[PDB]
Amino acid sequence: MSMEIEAPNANTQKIRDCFNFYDRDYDGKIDVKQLGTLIRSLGCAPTEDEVNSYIKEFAIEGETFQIEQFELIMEREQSKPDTREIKLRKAFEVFDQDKDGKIKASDLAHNLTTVGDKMTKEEVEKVFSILGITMESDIDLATFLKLVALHHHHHH
């Protein structure tokens, strides 16, 4: 019984796809093995530990019933991009929603303000040292690497 809830469709649909994929049997029930069948077919995660981690965190589990479907419903979320991928991206995402782990020079210092690091001529100065890219160059995974790896500061 819905109650005026738009919500995303791209993900909501994905779950149904993978769900009916293995549930095609039409048994009406779901086991702990079926939930992994999907990820095992496409190879989403490396080991069941991943899916089991999030799922287990949900609450509890058993042998087989039907509620197992939650695995997919949450999978679409747990699988989504988050701080888990990058630390810096986390601070940016807080302000710049468009943040996708990489942005130009404009958005770079734009979302940076969120991280509370104050990326000045210094930050960029070194960026061209390790990353080997000028200030007029968008940042990427490699960028966060040379940064997180650098490990510097001067505020305390």
Binding residues vs Ca ion (CB under 5 A):
23, 25, 27, 98-99, 103, 107
- C-alpha distances in angstroms, 56 versus 22, 68, 99, 141? 20, 11, 30, 30
Q: Provide the minimum distance between the beta carbon of 74 and Ca ion in the complex, in angstroms, as a whole number.
A: 18
Give the Cα-Cα-Cα angle 2, 68, 11 (nearest 5 degrees): 50
Closer to Ca ion by CB, 77 or 140: give it.
140
Closer to Ca ion by CB, 85 or 129: give it.
85
CA 30, CA 15: separation in Å to the nearest integer?
A: 14
Closer to Ca ion by CB, 21 or 54: give it.
21
CB-CB neighbours of 79 under 10 Å: 17
Q: Provide the minimum distance between the beta carbon of 143 and Ca ion in the complex, in angstroms, as a whole number.
A: 13
Q: Provide the minimum distance between the beta carbon of 154 and Ca ion in the complex, in angstroms, as a whole number.
A: 27
